[PDB]
From a paper:
HlyU is a conserved transcriptional regulator required for the activation of various virulence genes in Vibrio species. HlyU homologue in Vibrio species is a key regulatory protein that induces the expression of various virulence genes, suggesting that it could be an attractive target to develop the anti-virulence strategies against the pathogenic Vibrios. In the present study, we performed high-throughput screening of 8,385 compounds and identified a small-molecule inhibitor of HlyU, CM14, that significantly inhibited the HlyU activity in V. vulnificus. In conclusion, we identified a small molecule CM14 which inhibits HlyU activity by covalently modifying Cys30 and thus attenuates the virulence of Vibrio species.
The overall structure of the CM14-treated HlyU is similar to that of apo-HlyU. Although the moiety attached to Cys30 is partially visible presumably due to the high flexibility, this observation is consistent with the above result that CM14 modifies the Cys30 of HlyU. To this end, tandem mass spectrometric analysis was performed for the CM14-treated HlyU sample. Figure 6a clearly showed that the Cys30 residue (C#) in the HlyU peptide, RLQILC#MLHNQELSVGELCAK, was covalently modified by the moiety with molecular mass of 130.042 Da, indicating that a certain part of CM14, probably consisting of C9H7O, is attached to the Cys30 of HlyU. In addition, we found that the distance between two DNA-binding 𝛼-helices (𝛼4) in HlyU dimer by 2.9 Å, which may account for the impaired DNA-binding activity of HlyU. Taken together, the results indicated that CM14 reacts with the thiol group of Cys30 of HlyU via a putative chemical reaction involving Cys96, and consequently inhibits the DNA-binding activity of HlyU. Altogether, the results indicate that CM14-mediated Cys30 modification substantially changes the HlyU conformation, and thus inhibits HlyU binding to target DNA. Biochemical analysis indicated that CM14 prevents HlyU binding to its target promoter DNA. Further mass spectrometric and mutational analyses revealed that a part of CM14 covalently modifies Cys30, a well-conserved residue of HlyU proteins in Vibrio species, both in vitro and in vivo.
Residue numbers in the entry:
A (entry chain A), B (entry chain A): 4 to 98
Write the structure that this text describes.
């Protein structure tokens, strides 16, 4: 019943974070709002591939956007992902 | 440098948890030591497939074992996974 529904909900979030590039994006958005350009410069990633990771994180509800006429700013969306990144940040990001 | 080493270390742990069955096993081991039989009865899983999940979790350092002459008892191993399950438990396991 709920065991398979909650397990699925959590797995969706875990699968979205179980990627080196996707995790680095989320960790950078910890208590911070960044644009596509700011992420591109801080990650050495092509815009085409960076847009693919952002699309995956957006489709699964891990990040939400805000536009400043054409510039898109990204930020962590769900409280579950915010708590997940906060804990991971202290375990691996030295803070 | 460390960015790709720490990201890899965290991804290994996230990939191990990004599975409905593997996550249910870890959640059951939260502050609890259980044998193979106790897990088999509480999860409706075949012993062959349950041993495969336990082997994956063991190889990646998420669980460690203890034997009582022939009975194997499982428990969460790393402090990182213990903190991860503790947070997930409060977000989805209602406690």
């Amino acid at each position: 019943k709920d065991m398979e529904q909650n397990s699925a909900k959590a797995v969706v979030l875990l699968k979205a974070m179980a990627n080196e590039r996707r995790l680095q994006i989320l960790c950078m958005l910890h208590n911070q709002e960044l644009s596509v350009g700011e992420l591109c410069a801080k990650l050495q990633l092509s815009q085409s591939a960076l847009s693919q990771h952002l699309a995956w994180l957006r489709r699964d509800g891990l990040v939400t956007t805000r536009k400043e006429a054409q510039t898109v700013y990204y930020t962590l969306k769900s409280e579950e992902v915010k708590a997940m990144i906060k804990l991971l940040h202290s375990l691996y990001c030295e803070e």
